[PDB]
Amino acid sequence: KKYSIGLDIGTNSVGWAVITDEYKVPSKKFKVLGNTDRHSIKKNLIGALLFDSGETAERTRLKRTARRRYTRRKNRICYLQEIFSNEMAKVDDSFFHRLEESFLVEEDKKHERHPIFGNIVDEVAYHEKYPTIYHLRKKLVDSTDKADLRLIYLALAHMIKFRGHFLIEGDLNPDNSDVDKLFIQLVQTYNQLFEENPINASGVDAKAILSARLSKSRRLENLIAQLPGEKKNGLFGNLIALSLGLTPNFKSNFDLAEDAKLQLSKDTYDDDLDNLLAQIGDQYADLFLAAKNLSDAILLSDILRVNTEITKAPLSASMIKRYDEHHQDLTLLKALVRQQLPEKYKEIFFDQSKNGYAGYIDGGASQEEFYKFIKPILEKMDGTEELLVKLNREDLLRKQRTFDNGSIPHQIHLGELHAILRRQEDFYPFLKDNREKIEKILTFRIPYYVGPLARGNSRFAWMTRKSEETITPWNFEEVVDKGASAQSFIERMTNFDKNLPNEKVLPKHSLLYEYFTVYNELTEQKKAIVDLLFKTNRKVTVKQLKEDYFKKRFNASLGTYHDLLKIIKDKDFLDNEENEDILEDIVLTLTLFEDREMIEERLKTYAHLFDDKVMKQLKRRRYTGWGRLSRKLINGIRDKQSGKTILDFLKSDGFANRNFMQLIHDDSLTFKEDIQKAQVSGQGDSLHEHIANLAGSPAIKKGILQTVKVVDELVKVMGRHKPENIVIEMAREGLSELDKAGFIKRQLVETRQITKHVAQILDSRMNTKYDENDKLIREVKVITLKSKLVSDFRKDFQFYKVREINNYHHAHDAYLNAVVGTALIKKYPKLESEFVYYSNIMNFFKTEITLANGEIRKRPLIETNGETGEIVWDKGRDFATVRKVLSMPQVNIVKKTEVQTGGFSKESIRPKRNSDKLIARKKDWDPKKYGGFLWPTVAYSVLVVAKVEKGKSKKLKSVKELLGITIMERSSFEKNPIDFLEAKGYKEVKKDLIIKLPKYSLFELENGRKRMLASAKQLQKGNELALPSKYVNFLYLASHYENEQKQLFVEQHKHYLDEIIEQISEFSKRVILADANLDKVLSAYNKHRDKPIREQAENIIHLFTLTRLGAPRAFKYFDTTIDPKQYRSTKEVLDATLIHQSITGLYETRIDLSQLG
DNA sequence: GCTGACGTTTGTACTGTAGCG
RNA sequence: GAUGAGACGCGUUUUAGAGCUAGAAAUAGCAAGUUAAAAUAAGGCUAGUCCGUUAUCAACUUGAAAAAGUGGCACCGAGUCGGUGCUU
DNA sequence: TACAGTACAAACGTCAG
Secondary structure (H helix, E strand, O other): OOOEEEEEEOOOEEEEEEEEEEOOOOOOOEEEEEEOOOEEEOOEEEEEEEEOOOOHHHHHHHHHHHHHHHHHHHHHHHHHHOOOOOOOHHHHHOOHHHHHHHHHHOOOOOOOOOOOOEEEHHHHHHHHHHOHHHHHHHHHHHOOOOOOHHHHHHHHHHHHOOOOOOOOOOOOOOOOOOOHHHHHHHHHHHHOOOOOOOHHHHHHHOOOOOOOOOOOOHHHHHOOOOOOOOOOOHHHHHHHHOOOOOEEEEHHOOOOOOOEEOOOOOOOOHHHHHHHHHHOOOOOOOHHHHHHHHHHHHHHHOOOOOOOOOOHHHHHHHHHHHHHHHHHHHHHHHHHHHHHOOOOHHHHHHHOOOOOOOHHHHHOHHHHHHOOOOOOOOOOOOOOOOHHHHOOOOOOOOOOOOHHHHHOOOHHHHHHHHHHHHHHOOOOOOHHHOHHHHHHHHHOOOOOOOOOOOOOOOOOOOOOOOOOOOOOOOHHHHEHHHHHHHHHHHHHHHHHHHOOOOEEOOOOHHHHHHHHHHHHOOOOOOHHHHHHOOOOOOOHHHHHHHHHHOOOOOOOHHHHHHHHHHHHOOHHHHHOOHHHHHHHHHHHHHHHHHHHHHHHHHHHHHOOOOHHHHHHHHOOOOOOOOOOOOOOHHOOEEEOOOOOOOHHHHHHOOOOOOOOHHHHHHHOOOHHHHHHHOOOOOOOOHHHHHHHHOOOOOHHHHHHHHHHHHHHHHHHOOOOOOOOEEEEOOOOOOOOOOHHHHHHHHHHHHOOHHHHHHHHHHHHOOEEOOOOOOOEEEEOOEEOOOHHHHHHHHHOOOOOOOOOOOOHHHHHHHHHHHHHHHHHHHHHHHHHHHOOOOOHHHHOOOOEEEEOOOOEEOOOOOOOOOOOEEEEEEOOOOHHHHHHHHHOOOOOEEOOOOOOOOOHHHHHHHHEOOOOOOOOOOOOOHHHHHOOOOOEEEEEEEEEEEEEEEEOOOOOEEEEEEEEEEHHHHHHHHHOOOHHHHHHHOOOOOOHHHHEEEOOEEEEOOOHHHHHHEEEEEEEEOOOOOOOOHHHHHHHHOOOOOHHHHHHHHHOOHHHHHHHHHHHHHHHHHHHOOOOHHHHHHHHHHOOOOHHHHHHHHHHHHHHHHHOOEEOOOEOOOEEEEOOOOOOOOOHHHHEEEEEEEOOOEEEEEEEEHOOO
């Protein structure tokens, strides 16, 4: 007999349901394997697979980047120490070894305690002479003294490590460092985006309003009070506030519906800024870059404020003069305190937990916590005004290692490098011989297009070698094949157009992209409009359109047409038609790279077009990002009837215009057929490659894979017979004949490309037969549904969903996918070109139709299709079946058992203490002496039966125990489990009996109670409530008590509130075992029953957190908060029935673990 | 979010200890 | 909304930065403090200025692995699946 | 020889990241 499937593919679950011709689900009796006494189990063929959500590579990428950064940093040091190696070995033989084991305690350390000089006199006197490394650094710069080589090393290393940033290109000049010149460039950028309401920098001295001895807020308001055209709430004002490192609300400016807060000091500023630009435009990107550059410049004028000489180590000198300022302010504060406020001293300067100077130096407090502790203490205190104003301009008792040190360029460290090096060349000859080598060590940066410097063994790299020898800062220029590496960067980094695959996506400031998007929005008058307006200003207002042309604002812009007209300065060149592709490749070099030499090497191909000054400016220009479209989509394909391209149709289209999405979607044109012919993957792909070829989140792709697997298993069930229909939903998180048809399309048809891709995967998986001709035979037809059809079925037919009760709702939604899609496909035979891979198509389920006049019109109760004579939907019989299935108490819910993968532990390194639970950070490093990590991630648990040592008599006591293999020791456990377990103290373990138990491994124990494994030390809730349809339909309708017969349905059935509460009571006594929670709940229901039914229901809807599957989690009922009963034990599952579940969950293998021992 | 860290806060083995002249 | 490449700044951890004074003291008073080295997943071998947190994974039989293979039907009912009748 | 003194091992909240 024929059957169908429906699937509810969410980000966290895949509902699956099997339905016969009649919409009823089967219920096969499945075979059970293993040592239990149930040889079979009856299961309904409906279910949902639950799984933890597929996460992005982003955090792995961030970690990987950190790992490379640290490795290259201590190669930078190793290169330094190699250069110093022989000559240090003379000047102080053990010095680099003393610096190597500096982290060690004295018993572990082979050499002396004090790392620099060995002895306590010279090292203490180093620190007295130099309390901060910047004292040594400015000494070595200022002072031609023949200083001890150890000190040379320490300053050079404190610059080669911690070398600042590489954002300023070439040398340091006032055109890219002075706050004045840059504020001038920022106002030019503001006036470039907004030619309306500009401002003039001539009234504002950014060297003295900015960088003044006042706060961010004083300087902001002094700046506003000298701008004629602006005000502190406005756009330019918030840009300066942000530059000032304050946190403005640009949503007040762009009139955004959600809030939009920005702070340049914040570590997620890039994400927030990117959301801001998705929301406001792309034109703003050079405005915000100029404001970021201004923040870095005023940060540089604030940090570099000592100016006693131009060569005079200006960073080190300021860190010193700050130490001077800090030690006088600290002498002042301590004296102030102990003479005029004699108590409270200890909480400030000794406590070490509180946010005073104790916690600020000695403990864990940051400068902002310290300012929020100290401000309430300088307030209500006298004589302290000089300190309070230092705190107000955030200068009070600053550290030298702060969050602001990321403003420091590498040219500052190179000038101090060069000063130190060629201040001591004439005393150390190897400092002259290798000064170019050390200056390369700090200056060298691997370019963005070369990647990791692999030797074939990297997944990530593409670097191409001109020589087979070891890469270095010095030999990089010749051992890397830069050209081949950059061509490999070109070919790896180009993404591909999802509309037309295997075609490179354009740079998003491509000029063919610009002409296209302006024309697309603007849909010979077009030609006149763009030549007169869009080629003459960056953003055409509709007032200008009417005044300049209708007499005789638009989002889209030719901004790069304007940039190039500004930069290369001859207009007749950019309007010239054969000059498109030179310029397409210029914008492509210029968006692809961020390196000076690679841009210059590629622009050298064009050195004959433009003069070396504008070429210099063109290489100084830089663009970022990428569009969603390829030139073969915009201007390559062409219609076979009319004989023009998409772009030509955008330019001329007759009397009636079409948008780009219509040039794709239009039936009449041949673009859609060419696109759908091209949509397949080149030369094909595997299942896994195809899902990694889809356009979506990894969680959705995980759902798509679990969908494919539950389908392949729902045909491994019921004898390899394929389903006649598969219905898919990707979950949501008058009229003329062509308009009646458009309202059918509006109802029935998926707009989201991911689901069509799912239908393609399932189709190509299921359908594998062919004619004598090339014609496909498709044994399965794959249906894509839409949630509104389902949700209308749910809402209209009193058939409601409220997802707090149980995870059955995923399975019920897939059953709803199955019945709605399978009724639709036999109701409408001729419409299978319209959803397989009268106008309100949903009305065939209805009993009665309410018309626009108010009147009522009836339908047949049995609903049938006239094109076949087939019965399709028997109201009151299929409608009754679906209510049975939604009520039905057994639904297979499988939490996918998963090996936990991820970080070895939580990231924070905890201090040293006598606890055994600490995870050693190295193998040499005893946690009792060094500290270490905590909260290791259990990768999987393992059931071990063994002897272990017991008592002072050292008995070999036999134990069955659940041991947590952590992610760290998974590799060693899987290398040899016997010797790992023997090293864990488990003796003569039974190898054939060892049972691997990943997270969410399921056990059944008593009275049907199921409990599942979070870890060898923690368990989670298994079962869930079968509340029959009446109770769930009630509790939706009651929680939505606030059509009126639906309110009366809730004032009737009052007792269902009591019945639901006693069913959850019964159940959680049976399964949840949180007695004091049920007692609180039953007595609180007695306490609060006088609250309205609507309030009752909405609180009981939250109360199912008492029963929901998985982790115990806190919840509330009116005034009362109920805390989780955490199952931090595992002793019982050792004698439970372990269940190994199939990915659908139908097939089972059950191990009664009590039989093991 | 939710596994586990880290205390308190109870519940189990081992040695003492018992009015006496 | 996927993914990748180059740098930074901190943060943490241990160590070094002589503490002093008393006095039986489980440390009180005072003084000090700003910095640095090192490590930043353990580590791995093809030994690279690389790789190590994404994806993937119920169980059983073959297979180094890749991978393939493993569970009768229908009915009547439903507390998470229970029961009856044919069949091998 | 039953209970007392008391050194020792599971369980039960709030943090912690």
